[PDB]
Amino acid sequence: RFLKVKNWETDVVLTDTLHLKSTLETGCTEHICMGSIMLPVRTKDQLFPLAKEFLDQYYSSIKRFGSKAHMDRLEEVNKEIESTSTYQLKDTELIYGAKHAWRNASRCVGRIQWSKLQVFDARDCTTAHGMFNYICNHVKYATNKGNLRSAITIFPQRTDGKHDFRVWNSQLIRYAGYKQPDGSTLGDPANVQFTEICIQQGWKAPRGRFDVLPLLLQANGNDPELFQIPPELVLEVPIRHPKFDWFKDLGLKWYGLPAVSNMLLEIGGLEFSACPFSGWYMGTEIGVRDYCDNSRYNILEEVAKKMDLDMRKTSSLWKDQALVEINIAVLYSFQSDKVTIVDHHSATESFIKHMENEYRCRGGCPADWVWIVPPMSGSITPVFHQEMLNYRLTPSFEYQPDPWNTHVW
Amino acid sequence: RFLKVKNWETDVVLTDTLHLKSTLETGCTEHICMGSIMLPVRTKDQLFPLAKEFLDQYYSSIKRFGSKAHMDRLEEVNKEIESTSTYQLKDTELIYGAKHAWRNASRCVGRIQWSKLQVFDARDCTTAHGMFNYICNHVKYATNKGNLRSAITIFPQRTDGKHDFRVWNSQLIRYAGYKQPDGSTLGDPANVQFTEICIQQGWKAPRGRFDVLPLLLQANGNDPELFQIPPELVLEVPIRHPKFDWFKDLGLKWYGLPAVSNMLLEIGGLEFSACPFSGWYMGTEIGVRDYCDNSRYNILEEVAKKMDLDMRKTSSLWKDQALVEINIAVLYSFQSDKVTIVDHHSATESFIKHMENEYRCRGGCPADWVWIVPPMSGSITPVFHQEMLNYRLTPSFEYQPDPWNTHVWKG
Numbered sequence: 001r002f003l004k005v006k007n008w009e010t011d012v013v014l015t016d017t018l019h020l021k022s023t024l025e026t027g028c029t030e031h032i033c034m035g036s037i038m039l040p041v042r043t044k045d046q047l048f049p050l051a052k053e054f055l056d057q058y059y060s061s062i063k064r065f066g067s068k069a070h071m072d073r074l075e076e077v078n079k080e081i082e083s084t085s086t087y088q089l090k091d092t093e094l095i096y097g098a099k100h101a102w103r104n105a106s107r108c109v110g111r112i113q114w115s116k117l118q119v120f121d122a123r124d125c126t127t128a129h130g131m132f133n134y135i136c137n138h139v140k141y142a143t144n145k146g147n148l149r150s151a152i153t154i155f156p157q158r159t160d161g162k163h164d165f166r167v168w169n170s171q172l173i174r175y176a177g178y179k180q181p182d183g184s185t186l187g188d189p190a191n192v193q194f195t196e197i198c199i200q201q202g203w204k205a206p207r208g209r210f211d212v213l214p215l216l217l218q219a220n221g222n223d224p225e226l227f228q229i230p231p232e233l234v235l236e237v238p239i240r241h242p243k244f245d246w247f248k249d250l251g252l253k254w255y256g257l258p259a260v261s262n263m264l265l266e267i268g269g270l271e272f273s274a275c276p277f278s279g280w281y282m283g284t285e286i287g288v289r290d291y292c293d294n295s296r297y298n299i300l301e302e303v304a305k306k307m308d309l310d311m312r313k314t315s316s317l318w319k320d321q322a323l324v325e326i327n328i329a330v331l332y333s334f335q336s337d338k339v340t341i342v343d344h345h346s347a348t349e350s351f352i353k354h355m356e357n358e359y360r361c362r363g364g365c366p367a368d369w370v371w372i373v374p375p376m377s378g379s380i381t382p383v384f385h386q387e388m389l390n391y392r393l394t395p396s397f398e399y400q401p402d403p404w405n406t407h408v409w
Numbered sequence: 410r411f412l413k414v415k416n417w418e419t420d421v422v423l424t425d426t427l428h429l430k431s432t433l434e435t436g437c438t439e440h441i442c443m444g445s446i447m448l449p450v451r452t453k454d455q456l457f458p459l460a461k462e463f464l465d466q467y468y469s470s471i472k473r474f475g476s477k478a479h480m481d482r483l484e485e486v487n488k489e490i491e492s493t494s495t496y497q498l499k500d501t502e503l504i505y506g507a508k509h510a511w512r513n514a515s516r517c518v519g520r521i522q523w524s525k526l527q528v529f530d531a532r533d534c535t536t537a538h539g540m541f542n543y544i545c546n547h548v549k550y551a552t553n554k555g556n557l558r559s560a561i562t563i564f565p566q567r568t569d570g571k572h573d574f575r576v577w578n579s580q581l582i583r584y585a586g587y588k589q590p591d592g593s594t595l596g597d598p599a600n601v602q603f604t605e606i607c608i609q610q611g612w613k614a615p616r617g618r619f620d621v622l623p624l625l626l627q628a629n630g631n632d633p634e635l636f637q638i639p640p641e642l643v644l645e646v647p648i649r650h651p652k653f654d655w656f657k658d659l660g661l662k663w664y665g666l667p668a669v670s671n672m673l674l675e676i677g678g679l680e681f682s683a684c685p686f687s688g689w690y691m692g693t694e695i696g697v698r699d700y701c702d703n704s705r706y707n708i709l710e711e712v713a714k715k716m717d718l719d720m721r722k723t724s725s726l727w728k729d730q731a732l733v734e735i736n737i738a739v740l741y742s743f744q745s746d747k748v749t750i751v752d753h754h755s756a757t758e759s760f761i762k763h764m765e766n767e768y769r770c771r772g773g774c775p776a777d778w779v780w781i782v783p784p785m786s787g788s789i790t791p792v793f794h795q796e797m798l799n800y801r802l803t804p805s806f807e808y809q810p811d812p813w814n815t816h817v818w819k820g
């Protein structure tokens with residue numbers, strides 16, 4: 001029942017008890033581990049125990065468990081669900097919930113920051129036009145001219161499931177991708193399907209390498225509508241290298257604001273299907289994944305060629321050499337433009353300190369090792385050597401089906 | 410049931426049915442994943458089904474399932490178990506079993522090679538001296554003057570648990586570590602506890618940075634005895650860099666033969682507690698882990714100092730740059746000396762081909778992503794993008810407690 005986790009570099013052994021508060025399932029069984037798999041309406045009956053569990057955790061957190069106010073709130077919510085089949089969170093409960101969904105995010109290395117989240121309550125939003133305004137304001141607040149600030153914007157909860165709010169985009173800011181007659185892909189290959197949806201919905205595409213996608217916003221279950229983020233709100237960084245003069249000539253850039261927009265926020269049984277949230281980048285996200293994945297911008301070959309590396313043999317490690325240089329350029333370019341970015345050494349060092357705090361104060365920290373370890377230089381970061389237990393606590397950020405697969409027009 | 414795994418780079422989807430043959434447990438539950446945890450006398454009653462399921466697997470593999478030879482063999486083993494509480498494997502079954510424990514080893518990226526394994530049957534061994542001789546012969550055979558050959562040597566199985574054969578070394582060839590009174594370590598910090606045991610047992614330690622450990626060998630449950638591997642049988646490689654002439658003056662070297670000696674082989678319910686096996690290195694094992702772990706030789710700072718990298722801030726990626734140069738030097742050195750080694754790109758590419766072949770011919774390939782993904786440059790290797798399923802098939806290699814924790818000393 002009490003579980004131990006060991007760090008193999010330091011020999012420090014921590015004891016996890018928080019996993020006993022675990023609600024959702026992992027995908028693993030006693031017979032099979034599914035730890036490397038990417039992707040492994042609530043009735044009145046279903047909803048009250050979920051509200052109770054959340055309210056109990058909330059009242060505990062402000063040291064008023066079992067109090068008059070605790071018991072009166074539980075009764076109020078019970079009455080509301082029995083009468084209306086749902087209930088509404090107090091602003092304090094929504095802020096607590098969003099912060100804890102971040103705290104519980106087992107795949108996120110940046111959780112040391114969890115209590116410093118700005119929460120924008122957009123539950124009064126009714127139209128897609130309202131959504132666009134709120135999102136532009138999120139974008140401007142979070143960007144803060146390069147001094148990035150963590151934020152979430154929360155739109156109205158699911159009701160009967162026919163009036164969902166949804167941002168159809170996977171992040172607020174992403175680049176278009178276009179299948180060419182050539183057979184190659186122009187832009188970001190990850191976004192080819194979504195760009196096709198936008199064009200079919202009437203977006204006039206510039207058909208370039210780094211075209212910022214419009215937002216496709218769905219309010220109150222209505223058909224989604226198109227909006228362009230004001231260009232002057234989208235901060236972008238040209239990529240250059242501190243030593244290699246030729247790097248700038250590759251014509252690379254990236255955006256400053258990573259803002260995930262397709263996840264679902266579950267708080268006390270309630271489901272917030274449009275809840276875009278943002279922090280700041282870890283450099284390997286752009287330099288390793290977005291630039292060097294074979295199915296992404298796939299620039300390893302081009303950079304290796306400019307460096308004049310021996311590309312005849314895998315064992316010269318030309319791919320590894322070019323990888324480090326691309327990642328040096330990403331960090332240098334963001335730092336020179338004074339746009340917040342974290343390197344993987346500093347980010348993982350932080351997460352370790354966070355994990356230690358969480359073990360001492362909360363009895364544990366759910367963590368998905370497969371996601372926490374950076375996609376380059378894994379064992380030279382401290383998280384590689386750290387045993388982690390993965391489990392699902394609520395409030396939570398959850399994946400949900402892409403809306404074009406689900407939406408009836 | 411069918412389970413699907415996807416490659417997120419190619420969109421190839423494979424279907425696993427082999428997991429249905431898994432009986433052993435993982436540590437995971439519907440509520441917790443223990444995927445990154447390093448370590449998560451049998452009765453007659455439990456022994457016959459394990460025997461039977463193994464012999465069913467063996468006979469199917471030779472297309473003789475349900476033959477008279479198969480039925481006669483089950484009857485023979487059943488009678489041997491009923492009367493002696495154990496049984497003896499035939500040589501063919503032992504070879505099949507060792508090959509399959511390797512095929513089934515979910516943490517091994519080198520399994521494309523599984524069907525090429527030289528099996529040395531040492532089940533006639535009775536003493537630690539005889540163990541020493543078997544192991545010297547394994548080292549010479551597997552080394553093959555640098556053209557490495559995979560091999561395993563199998564000592565007698567467990568009987569009552571009071572007569573176990575054990576190699577107390579974690580690998581056949583490893584370097585001593587010495588803790589100094591000032592708290593520093595000379596040599597390999599991984600091997601400090603074991604070195605202390607060797608010295609206590611009588612080893613005259615040279616006290617240098619790369620001292621090959623003596624073997625410490627336990628036969629038939631007796632107290633272990635020390636032996637030195639003949640120096641001429643221990644192939645080593647001086648480390649140098651193709652471009653940086655100062656690299657050689659770091660005074661680095663490593664041994665050619667990686668040979669795991671502390672694991673237990675389970676075949677058909679029988680337990681082979683002493684079963685050293687060897688292959689060849691993937692370069693990151695030495696260059697990333699052995700040299701660059703903070704708790705191992707820890708050379709990153711010294712290498713970066715010599716490269717004149719900006720070390721004031723981690724965001725210059727100085728550790729990453731020095732890491733690549735060290736790994737280049739390891740691969741270059743071994744290749745220059747004609748000692749078998751494989752780079753992490755080659756090894757992971759071959760593993761993906763092996764895995765896809767296994768899915769098609771066997772219905773699956775259990776694999777532990779946490780171990781399979783290399784410790785540098787993970788996502789530029791194809792295994793990072795491959796979903797894998799981890800489960801436990803028999804025959805298998807298992808961890809076992811260190812023998813100094815469990816040994817009853819006779820005196």
Ligand code: HEM
Nearest residue numbers: 102105107108109110113150151277278279280281282397
């Ligand atoms: C403040 C700076 C932050 C840093 C440096 C950071 C770091 C990261 C990184 C590197 C990833 C992996 C992303 C990927 O590989 O695609 C990640 C994932 C994630 N983060 Fe954060 N994070 C930050 C803020 C936040 C915030 C503000 C939230 C929510 C309020 C959050 C919740 C999540 C979630 C739910 C995931 C998993 C996303 C997915 O599954 O695709 N993080 N984080």
Ligand code: HEM
Nearest residue numbers: 511514516517518519522559560686687688689690691806
């Ligand atoms: C032919 C070349 C081989 C290569 C390139 C190779 C590669 C690897 C690597 C890189 C590891 C991880 C080692 C570590 O991080 O400590 C490993 C683990 C392992 N390999 Fe291999 N291997 C080979 C041969 C073999 C052989 C001959 C066997 C047994 C007959 C075997 C069975 C295993 C097992 C059981 C592990 C897990 C060890 C542990 O848990 O400590 N492999 N392999």
Ligand SMILES: C[C@H](O)[C@H](O)[C@H]1CNc2nc(N)[nH]c(=O)c2N1
Nearest residue numbers: 036037038370371793794795796
């Ligand atoms: C198949 C495997 O689960 C997949 O490639 C994962 C591995 N680890 C990851 N880790 C992070 N942070 N982000 C990712 O997208 C992935 N992809």
Ligand SMILES: C[C@H](O)[C@H](O)[C@H]1CNc2nc(N)[nH]c(=O)c2N1
Nearest residue numbers: 384385386387445446447779780
């Ligand atoms: C805690 C964690 O599981 C541990 O550091 C693992 C990670 N992956 C590994 N992978 C390999 N091949 N070898 C190892 O020793 C480890 N160590």
Ligand SMILES: CCSCCC(=N)NCCC[C@H](N)C(=O)O
Nearest residue numbers: 258260277278279280281282285
């Ligand atoms: C928003 C929650 S995590 C904080 C932001 C972030 N550091 N990453 C978000 C994902 C970005 C994606 N990996 C990309 O490379 O564009």
Ligand SMILES: CCSCCC(=N)NCCC[C@H](N)C(=O)O
Nearest residue numbers: 667669686687688689690691694
């Ligand atoms: C023997 C079974 S796997 C094949 C050999 C091997 N490539 N490594 C074994 C482990 C070596 C350890 N990581 C080290 O760096 O010394």
Ligand SMILES: [Zn+2]
Nearest residue numbers: 028033437442
């Ligand atoms: Zn698991």
